[PDB]
Design a protein around this ligand. Structure first.
Ligand SMILES: CC[C@H]1OC(=O)[C@H](C)[C@@H](O[C@H]2C[C@@](C)(OC)[C@@H](O)[C@H](C)O2)[C@H](C)[C@@H](O[C@@H]2O[C@H](C)C[C@H](N(C)C)[C@H]2O)[C@](C)(O)C[C@@H](C)CN(C)[C@H](C)[C@@H](O)[C@]1(C)O
Ligand SMILES: CC(C)CCC[C@@H](C)[C@H]1CC[C@H]2[C@@H]3CC=C4C[C@@H](O)CC[C@]4(C)[C@H]3CC[C@]12C
Ligand SMILES: CC(C)CCC[C@@H](C)[C@H]1CC[C@H]2[C@@H]3CC=C4C[C@@H](O)CC[C@]4(C)[C@H]3CC[C@]12C
Lengths: 233, 338, 58, 285, 235
């Protein structure tokens, strides 16, 4: 599984550039696609989402309408046509894949990221107060986050995702719903919560754990992330 | 020498029959006469699962009580979410004729067999996200009637060649072979501990096998016709059998003989599947009359009838938690009752 | 020959079938009844459970 | 009424006998369809739909007999009248449309090659049954207001008058009854041709009997529906009281024939199939 | 309403799977299924090879006649016992039973096999197309006057050629008599106890004949015509 992205360079305000995203090693048609932007020295934000088959397409409020998402299954590629570029849009854009079925692991694979250098409402607010939490190897670490609205649903699932972005590397999934470890994640990581405040605990710290940890909600499609807590060695 | 062997076999059969008759000091009917009647166990079709194109032929619950795997002769394995009736997976099959399906206790694999003589094990946790034929175990010279998962690596299958085989899925070879049956091994049931299991064949016989030793420890010949279904009592010390004779039978492993016969004058067809409730006091049996029957195990009285089917009931299975039961019929409908 | 070999297999399997401990039918019935009584509460089919607990239909 | 009682009472006798026969046959058909699920096949759905239609019609017979006996008392209520000369006409149109649908279905089933055979779905059957019953309840809509008016309303005035289109509406009533001529020639052309084509295919044990049944069905359709539409038109041109008497006679004959239509339709379309006979015997036993 | 985002996504995936299922349904209802049964000596292999030149179990063979797609399923590795796995083969359009007309020694077992198929509980509705293969061998044996049918079958001495039957051109009377008697032997069993729900269509075929597919197409057309005549209240 590899998603390689291209089509991002120096653009001026008001321009229109298209990003292309090519997948190899998995069924592109079955999976849904998401676009996530990381603004320099900033957190993660969700750009757009296309469902498998193009039966459901959503966009973020900030880029509502201006940005478009379209997929070409026969060529196994995804596009993003930009319009009315602004200085705030400069960011590294990644492709994420999400298949949605009982026992799935959405937001599993993330793309490397294309750099782009140009020149809210009833949306759950995720807070991670601790900006920096210095810890030494071998010691246990804890990261706490919260949500304005309860993340628990009648179905009984807590829609919280814990990701980690390492220095100079793309983000990865650690916990998909508040308790379950993603494929290939060390057992050290663990997650717990009640519905309003959630904790991610690392039993013993190592050298590949350092990075910025982010928490995201999935109760409503205006998917929101947190400032992210940085763990120092 | 051959005549001596036959006479010795007859003498051994007589000895076993004498021991069985001696062991029978009391009858369950007499023992459980004072037990309170079970009452009228009435059930309703909570959910109806549709989407199959042909006759549903196999079903199996997972360790969790939310996922079903059903097989159809059209050549498809469909995995349904019972709570929401959603097709999680739709796996095409190379061979259209499918007669058995299995769900691994961990839920990482699903098995599929039939007239193709090959047991296909499919992986649902693939990184690529598409179900693939992880293994295609061949070697059986007869159609596969049943297959059950002991663990992710070991799978037990019964074929129409009058044999059963334990397959190491990774190596794909018959680690152990169980032979001795005189007819097709239609029904298989693994014990809760998975150390022992029971296989019922078309020769009106059932056999108790040990996976490790590889011998048929006990033989039961209570039925007068072909045995089409066998299930294990929840305790592990008895098993129920449904045959073409139109009568269900309880056989306890410890005493080594039948303990009850369930039969009614109104039924003359064969039995397709048999299962037990969590406590084992409700024997659920599917019949060719498009109806299913809930008998009382300890008293042999029809507690209920589930008549919501339009064709032969081919599959029957009770959840691990026991909250609901699932019936699959030749009408292409998989219905949940409770 | 092969016929006598199959016959000697059948005899030995019957022999293995005959050397096994057998309990009284009364004890087996008592064990079954005790198991059912002990776990009678557990089974929702024999014992209907409230609507909230059951997943299907509320 | 303008009839000799010696000639009116006999029509009442025959009408009551036809009522009993038709009602019994159609309730038996509907009960057979409902009781057993195996009977709910594509053709039997149309059959049961038109059994409902037929029965709704034969339930209009008692009021026809009343109007035959009662010249112009018409003591019942006005909107009772209007719904009565509207549900009847809608059910008649539904029956004709369902017969056309049956002929089309049979032609597609038997004449078409295996290469192009239709993939019949219960959706399209349950769709056309509910679309055709609308093209009927909307094409009978003109009668709902046009007529049903007690033209004339004192003990002498208690007799009042009966339902009939006051001269004004009659302008558009004629206009509507002539459009209804379509409902005669659309089935007639279909049933005559399609079945006939089928007749060739089966005429190219039991095939001859099937062709005989088809021929009997088309001939019954002719002798039962031509009279109706012949007399509806004889009636919209009547200006002579004497030949209006003849028109009354022509249409007492047509009405009894149309209720025959209702009673023989179940026999012709259902009693000939082995499945329906087996279901009837099972119900009796 | 109450459903969450991921629940709606799973529902959409279910709708996609249902759409694929309908796509497969169209083809499944379009395809015509046939069950090829025959003795080992019977030339079923020859017919199978002819078709596709236009521990494995079921062997399929797909062909097309007049744009109609025929799947033909052959059972090779299943055990000798047949009472159980015949169940999976009901709902088939036709059972192509191939019988060796050359060998009269094993024709009694062939008749018993055809009777077992005819009087099966699960195959009462399905129709059977009887192909008597190796007509050339039948003619060679009959006209070599060395193997006598009367030896194996007694009644052949009394049987007389039916005048209703139409003899083929360039065929000796003995070959016609033998072939039509062998046909009547199966037809007598087929007609009795059939009750009309299933019909047999005997055909005289040869080893490398090219008309087998069209004969099968005509038989399937007749079977479907009867099925429709029943399902459409025409009978
Ligand atoms: C002047 C008043 C007359 O009353 C009318 O005008 C009615 C509205 C008339 O109806 C008028 C108006 C209209 C539109 O039918 C409703 C027209 O089609 C017929 C010819 O005349 C009735 C309903 C016609 O009976 C209807 O005949 C239709 C052709 C079929 C329909 N069906 C539902 C069974 C049936 O009820 C009928 C054929 O006349 C019935 C016939 C057996 C009895 N008549 C002989 C009586 C004595 C009438 O002449 C009358 C009471 O004196
Ligand atoms: C195409 C396959 C699936 C067969 C179905 C054909 C259907 C859709 C078509 C063929 C001809 C059609 C009929 C043509 C004319 C009329 C008269 C008008 O008052 C509308 C209904 C009616 C009676 C139509 C009903 C629908 C009909 C029967
Ligand atoms: C004006 C009044 C008197 C007319 C009332 C007519 C009623 C009885 C008609 C109108 C629409 C009809 C339904 C239309 C379609 C179908 C689908 C078919 O699969 C079964 C019958 C069924 C369900 C019909 C039943 C009868 C029905 C309800």
């Amino acid at each position: 599984v590899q998603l390689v992205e291209s089509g991002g360079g120096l653009v001026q305000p008001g321009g229109s550039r298209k990003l292309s995203c090519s997948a190899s090693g998995f069924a592109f048609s079955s999976f849904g696609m998401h676009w996530v932007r990381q603004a320099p020295e900033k957190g993660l934000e969700w750009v757009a989402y296309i469902s498998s088959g193009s039966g459901t397409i959503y966009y973020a409020d900030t880029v509502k309408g201006r940005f478009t998402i379209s997929r070409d299954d026969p060529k196994n590629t995804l596009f993003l046509q930009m319009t009315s570029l602004r200085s705030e849009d400069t960011a590294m854009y990644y492709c994420v894949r999400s298949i949605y079925y009982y026992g799935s692991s959405p937001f599993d694979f993330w793309g490397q990221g294309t750099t782009l250098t140009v020149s809210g409402s009833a949306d759950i607010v995720m807070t991670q107060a601790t900006s920096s939490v210095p810890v030494t190897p071998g010691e246990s670490v804890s990261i706490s986050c919260r949500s304005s609205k309860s993340l628990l649903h009648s179905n009984g699932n807590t829609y919280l995702y814990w990701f980690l972005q390492r220095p100079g590397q793309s983000p990865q999934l650690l916990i998909y719903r508040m308790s379950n470890l993603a494929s290939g994640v060390p057992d050290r990581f663990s997650g717990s919560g009640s519905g309003t405040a959630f904790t991610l605990t690392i039993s013993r710290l190592e050298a590949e754990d350092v990075g910025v940890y982010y928490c995201m909600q999935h109760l409503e499609y205006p998917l929101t992330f947190g400032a992210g807590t940085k763990l120092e060695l | 020498e051959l005549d001596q062997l036959r006479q010795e076999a007859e003498q051994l059969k007589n000895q076993i029959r004498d021991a069985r008759k001696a062991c029978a000091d009391a009858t369950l009917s007499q023992i459980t006469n004072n037990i309170d009647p079970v009452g009228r166990i009435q059930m309703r079709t909570r959910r109806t699962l549709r989407g199959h194109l042909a006759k549903i032929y196999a079903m199996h619950w997972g360790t969790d009580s939310r996922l079903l795997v059903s097989a159809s002769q059209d050549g498809k394995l469909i995995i349904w979410d019972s709570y929401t009736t959603n097709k999680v997976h739709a796996i095409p099959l190379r061979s259209s004729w499918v007669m058995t399906c299995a769900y691994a206790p961990s839920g990482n694999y699903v098995a599929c067999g039939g007239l193709d003589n090959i047991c296909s094990i499919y992986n649902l946790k693939t990184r690529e996200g598409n179900v693939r034929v992880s293994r295609e175990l061949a070697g059986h010279t007869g159609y596969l009637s049943c297959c059950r998962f002991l663990d992710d690596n070991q799978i037990v299958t019964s074929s129409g060649d009058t044999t059963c085989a334990l397959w190491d899925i990774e190596t794909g070879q018959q680690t152990t072979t169980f032979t001795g049956h005189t007819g097709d091994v239609m029904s298989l049931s693994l014990a809760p501990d998975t150390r022992l299991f029971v296989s019922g064949a078309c020769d009106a016989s059932a056999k108790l096998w040990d996976v490790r030793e590889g011998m048929c420890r006990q033989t039961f010949t209570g039925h007068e016709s072909d045995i089409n279904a066998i299930c294990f009592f929840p305790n592990g010390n008895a098993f129920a059998t449904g045959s073409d004779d139109a009568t269900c039978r309880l056989f306890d492993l410890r005493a080594d003989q039948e303990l009850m016969t369930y039969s009614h004058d109104n039924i003359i067809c064969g039995i397709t599947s048999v299962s037990f409730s969590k406590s084992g006091r409700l024997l659920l049996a599917g019949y060719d009359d498009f109806n299913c029957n809930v008998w009382d195990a300890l008293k042999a009285d029809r507690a209920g009838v589930l008549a919501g089917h339009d064709n032969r009931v081919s599959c029957l299975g009770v959840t691990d938690d026991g909250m609901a039961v699932a019936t699959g019929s030749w009408d292409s409908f998989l219905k949940i009752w409770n | 020959t092969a016929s006598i070999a199959q016959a000697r297999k059948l005899v030995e399997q019957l022999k293995m079938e005959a050397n096994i401990d057998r309990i009284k039918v009364s004890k087996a019935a008592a064990d079954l009844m005790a198991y059912c009584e002990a776990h009678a509460k557990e089974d929702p089919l024999l014992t209907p459970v409230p609507a909230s607990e059951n997943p299907f239909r509320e | 009424s303008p009839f000799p009682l010696g000639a009116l009472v006999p029509v009442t006798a025959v009408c009551l006998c036809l009522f009993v026969v038709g009602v019994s046959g159609n309730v038996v058909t509907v009960m057979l369809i409902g009781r057993y699920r195996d009977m709910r096949t594509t053709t039997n759905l149309y059959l049961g739909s038109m059994a409902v239609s037929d029965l709704l019609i034969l339930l209009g017979l008692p009021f026809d007999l009343y109007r035959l006996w009662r010249s112009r008392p018409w003591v019942f209520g006005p909107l009772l009248c209007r719904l009565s000369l509207y549900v009847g006409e809608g059910c008649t149109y539904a029956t004709l449309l369902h017969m056309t649908a049956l002929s089309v279905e049979r032609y597609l089933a038997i004449c078409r090659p295996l290469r192009a055979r239709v993939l019949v779905t219960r959706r399209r059957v349950r769709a056309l049954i509910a679309v055709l019953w609308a093209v009927a309840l909307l094409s009978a809509g003109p009668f709902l207001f046009l007529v049903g008016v007690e033209q004339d309303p004192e003990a002498a005035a208690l007799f009042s008058r009966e339902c009939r289109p006051s001269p004004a509406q009659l302008g558009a009533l004629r206009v509507m009854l002539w459009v209804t001529t379509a409902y005669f020639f659309l089935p007639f052309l279909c049933l005559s041709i399609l079945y006939g084509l089928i007749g060739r295919e089966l005429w190219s044990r039991g095939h001859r009997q099937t062709v005989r049944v088809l021929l009997v069905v088309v001939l019954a359709f002719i002798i039962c529906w031509l009279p109706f539409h012949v007399g509806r038109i004889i009636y919209i041109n009547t200006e002579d009281s004497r030949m209006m008497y003849f028109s009354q006679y022509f249409n007492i004959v047509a009405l009894q024939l149309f209720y025959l239509s209702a009673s023989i339709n179940p026999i012709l379309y259902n009693l000939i199939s082995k499945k329906y006979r087996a279901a009837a015997f099972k119900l009796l036993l | 309403c109450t459903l969450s985002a991921e629940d709606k996504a799973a529902v959409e995936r279910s709708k996609m799977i249902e759409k694929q299922l309908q796509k497969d349904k169209q083809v499944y209802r379009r395809t015509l299924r046939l069950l090829l049964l025959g003795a080992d000596n019977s030339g079923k292999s020859t017919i199978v090879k002819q078709m596709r030149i236009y521990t494995s179990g079921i062997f399929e063979t797909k062909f097309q006649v007049d744009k109609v797609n025929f799947h033909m399923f052959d059972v090779g590795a299943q055990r000798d016992e047949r009472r159980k796995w015949i169940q999976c083969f009901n709902d088939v359009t036709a059972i192509i039973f191939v019988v060796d007309s050359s060998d009269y020694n094993r024709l009694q077992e062939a008749l018993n096999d055809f009777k077992s198929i005819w009087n099966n509980r699960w195959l009462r509705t399905i129709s059977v197309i009887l192909f008597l293969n190796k007509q050339d061998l039948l003619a060679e044996k009959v006209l070599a006057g060395k193997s006598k049918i009367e030896d194996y079958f007694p009644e052949f001495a009394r049987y007389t050629t039916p005048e209703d039957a139409t003899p083929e051109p360039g065929e000796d009377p003995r070959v016609t008599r033998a072939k039509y008697f062998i046909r009547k032997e199966f037809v007598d069993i087929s007609t009795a106890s059939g009750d009309g729900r299933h019909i047999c269509y005997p055909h005289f075929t040869c080893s490398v004949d090219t008309e087998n597919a069209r004969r099968i197409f005509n038989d399937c057309k007749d079977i479907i015509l009867q099925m429709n005549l029943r399902e459409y209240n025409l009978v």
